[model samples]
Every structure is written in structure tokens, then in C-alpha cells.
Target: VLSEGEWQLVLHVWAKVEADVAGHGQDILIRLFKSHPETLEKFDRFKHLKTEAEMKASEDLKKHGVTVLTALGAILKKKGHHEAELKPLAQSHATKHKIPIKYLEFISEAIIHVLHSRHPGDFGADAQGAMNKALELFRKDIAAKYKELGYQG
Candidate 1:
């Protein structure tokens, strides 16, 4: 239930993560949670952790976190499970927050900054390429979804 622009922003953020994790490992997740406190709720035990180190020390924390995040990015890239990953959250946020889709742009930008700050050395042209690929897939998926919903974008 995302507006066209919001869908694009979600794609951009997914692509950023895909690019960041290409060579790096769980460090990307470590950096993301550190940068954005909001996403921490997506983790199971991260919500209850009293400190950053405690969150980091959770059982197979790095591995599990990376796997889940990467899987989410991959799902976006593949255009499968878009509804599950993004739609419900977008709908709820749009309704409860009464905010414009433009806010998603800022969130996406923050996600990119978080990834960049976490693994500065790993990003470059290749990462950008992956991001572009993600955007391409995103655009296609949105187009299809809009058609299915009988809405024009």
C-alpha cells in the first residue's frame, strides 16, 4: 500500500544494503542498528537489550542479523514477498503517522548513511551498480503491483 515514491525509496534503501553487504559481512547489520535505533525492533532480542554491546553479544547475533537483513534485501531485489516486507508497514505508518511519503525518502537516506558509515571502504562503483540493479527491479515490481491494484502511478 505504498505510494509510488515511497515504493521507490524502499527499493533504494534495499539496494543500498545489498551493495553494502556484497563483500562485508555482519558488520553491516552492526552498523545499521548502531545508526538507526528504529530498525532495532525488527530484531527479536534487540528490543530488550540494555546496551549496544549486549545487543551485539546476542547468540549468533551477527550471523542471524546479517542473514535476516540480507534475505530481506534479496527478497526486494527478486520482487518476491514485497507485500510481507513492506506493504503492511507502509500502510500502518501512513495511517498512524499521517505523514507524507516524502518521509520515506529521509528514512532511506539515513539507511544509506548508516551503511556507508559502517563499511566505508567496501563501497564504490560496484556497490552503486548493485543499487542500480535493485532500483530497476523495484520499479518493475511497483509497476506490476500498481496494475494489479488497478491504480495508476
Candidate 2:
């Protein structure tokens, strides 16, 4: 379990990802997996694949993962761009991934698990503070990317 502050940080990150860049949220997940391979085992859907075809196909299902990542990163790096342009791609990727309208809830849970493993602690106040700061930095970077990509909210 996470402390209140840690939970709040998680919640904030989820909200920003969902409300601002729901379409490319999976790209964030993918990038996280790339950066931290250990977390890959946590997702049953992606654990068994070993072939380039399977992985590439799964990635291609979303249409230009690199582009999505680039755009998302750009938006988070800046604050005021045309987010409307990104909605179509977001909607497309969301549909492709079968992300239900309420999928953000599940994404939030996944993030908590990933973070807990990446930064294990006993949910103490000090741990919460550290988690909060780390999450804040992450959010800032991602939010700037979203903004740079024309996301308004």
C-alpha cells in the first residue's frame, strides 16, 4: 500500500495521462517497460512473446508507436498546443487497444504496481515524500511532452 502522498502522486499522474493524453498512455507504458525491463513480467499479456513479428505486430497495432511517443513527449515538454489534432490518433489507439472508456482506472493500478517495484518502500511518510517528488518530476516531463504535441489540457 502507498502512503497518502504517494497515492496522490499516482493519482495525479494517472489523471494527467488520462485527461490529457489518453491515446498515447500505452506508449508511456511501453516506454516504461523499455526503460525498466523487470516490470515487463508483471503484464501477462506481454510476457510470453519472444519473436520480433509478434512484438512488432503488437506494437504496430497502435499505429506508429514511436510517433505517438514523440508527440506525447513533445506535449509534456510544452504546455499549450493544439490537442484537438491529437484526439483522432488518441481515439484510434484507444480503440485499437480496446481501452474501455474507464480504462484509466486500470492504468492507474498498473502504474502503482510498477512504481512500487521500482521504488519499494514500506509506505512510510518519508517514502511517500520521495515518491511524490519522483512522480512530480515524471509528470512534469510527460506533461511538457503533451503540451508540446498540441495538447491543451
Query: Which candidate tops lDDT?
Result: 1
lDDT (tens digit, per residue) of candidate 1 on 11-101: 6545555664533335545555666666566546556765767755666666665664664565564443465555544444445433334
Name the regions of candidate 2 deviating beyond 4 angstroms: 1-75, 79-86, 120-153
Tens-digit per-residue lDDT, 88-148, candidate 2: 5445534444333223333334444544444444434454454444434444443444455
Q: What is the model-wide C-alpha lDDT for candidate 1? A: 0.51
Residue 106 of model 2: what lDDT? Answer: 38
For residue 3, what is the lDDT in candidate 1? 41
TM-score of each: 0.41, 0.31
Error of 1 at 77 (Å): 7.7
